[PDB]
Design a protein around this ligand. Structure first.
Ligand SMILES: N[C@@H](CCC(=O)N[C@@H](CSSC[C@H](NC(=O)CC[C@H](N)C(=O)O)C(=O)NCC(=O)O)C(=O)NCC(=O)O)C(=O)O
Ligand SMILES: N[C@@H](CCC(=O)N[C@@H](CSSC[C@H](NC(=O)CC[C@H](N)C(=O)O)C(=O)NCC(=O)O)C(=O)NCC(=O)O)C(=O)O
Lengths: 204, 208
């Protein structure tokens, strides 16, 4: 079968990896973990990702080598296929920089907006405001960069793939993109890519 | 003279990079930014890091190339020097995985514990508990891995360097390490390293 096993769920972080696999044309096997049944905390899965979160992959071509953390999976797959990250020092670093910005900024902060605005047992408007405002600030950083280049690292790369599934759900998080015309251009460009469309449907 | 300019402050995230440079033996020029004077938001610095945060470096050996995000700086420098990250596929990836775990988990979550426990004007015990509990859960992940391997990726690497400055301040964040014997072993090993001690002194904490 496929050489990549993908452990995932219908979430922004899972969609990063299914989008990348679809863009790269790599076959994969989907393991859709049920958070309802706490399958992401099963010790059989903890052997693959000790953090007990999705996504994770196992590369069957590499002696069943596990890779956890969406950003690390994106780097691993880009380096395996030679796609979606340049090989030169500056070009690869620009991808890694914007990927790290997503991994330490956009994902964590927008995820906390979702917690306080949608999930938390009571409404704490000061915490909601903190994370919605911070996410907007991060979106403004993105927008400025997207006036310098068509995609975050220049050419389209894994940095865009990491960032887009989060920006796509800004309405759920209560964070606006109005006034960020470069970000909106990039949203439209990403949305029009067939591989993005396919990756957003994994898992069903 | 030094060909790396380091823009930093006395904080866990800045210490990751000074520790790495000290371990690598790569000279650098320190630019200690004053948060009180808002130097991290000055236009000149935003041209280096558009996020307006430290750390950032400028590599004077390749046309003043800027690198922002501590984790990206660690990858950039490890690749340049050939140190603190293997070059084979599996060894490189294990380092990147644990580095990402720090960058997306330990740093963000412990940072939020610090905000709510010790900076935010509103005292929100549910938010404090959320982030102290999550930081502890992340420490338990580290502890389990450190029962299988001496350092997070096997050999000591940039992943340990990224993680240690945060773990070191656990008590300040209100998070205990009791019951995490492997993490405690690793804390003692990191604290003993001369380059860790040197890097923790740079720049001459401002925030956490
Ligand atoms: N840094 C990791 C994050 C992976 C991650 O967050 N996985 C989520 C699904 S993505 S859905 C978005 C996700 N939210 C959550 O996981 C909500 C539950 C969580 N336990 C909590 O209390 O915050 C989030 O905010 N992520 C922050 C980020 O990306 O930095 C998961 O498996 N959760 C199951 C669990 O926790 O038991 C990566 O990039 O792969
Ligand atoms: N992902 C970046 C994070 C760098 C970072 O946070 N730098 C801080 C100093 S380290 S001190 C630790 C830092 N806290 C802060 O920066 C507190 C101020 C912030 N604006 C807030 O509201 O949270 C934090 O929690 N970081 C989370 C993480 O590492 O993921 C900074 O320059 N702040 C200036 C500013 O905000 O104006 C990296 O790894 O380089």
């Amino acid at each position: 079968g496929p050489m990549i096993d993908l452990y995932t769920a219908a979430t922004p972080n899972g969609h990063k990896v299914s989008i990348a696999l679809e863009e790269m044309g790599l076959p994969y096997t989907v393991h859709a973990l049920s958070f309802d049944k706490k399958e992401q905390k099963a010790p059989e899965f903890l052997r693959i990702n000790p953090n007990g979160r999705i996504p994770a992959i196992v590369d069957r071509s590499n002696d069943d080598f596990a890779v956890f953390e969406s950003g690390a999976i994106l780097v691993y797959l880009a380096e395996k296929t030679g796609q979606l990250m340049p090989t030169d020092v500056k070009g690869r670093s620009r991808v890694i920089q914007w990927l790290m910005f997503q991994m330490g900024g956009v994902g964590p902060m927008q995820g906390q907006a979702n917690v306080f605005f949608r999930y938390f047992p009571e409404k704490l408007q000061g915490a909601i405001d903190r994370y919605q405002h911070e996410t907007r600030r991060l979106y403004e950083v993105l927008d400025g960069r997207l006036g310098e280049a068509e995609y975050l690292a220049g050419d389209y790369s894994i940095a865009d793939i990491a960032t887009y599934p989060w920006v796509r759900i800004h309405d759920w998080s209560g964070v606006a993109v109005d006034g960020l015309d470069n970000l909106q251009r990039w949203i439209a460009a990403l949305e029009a890519r067939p591989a993005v469309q396919r990756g957003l449907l994994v898992p069903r």
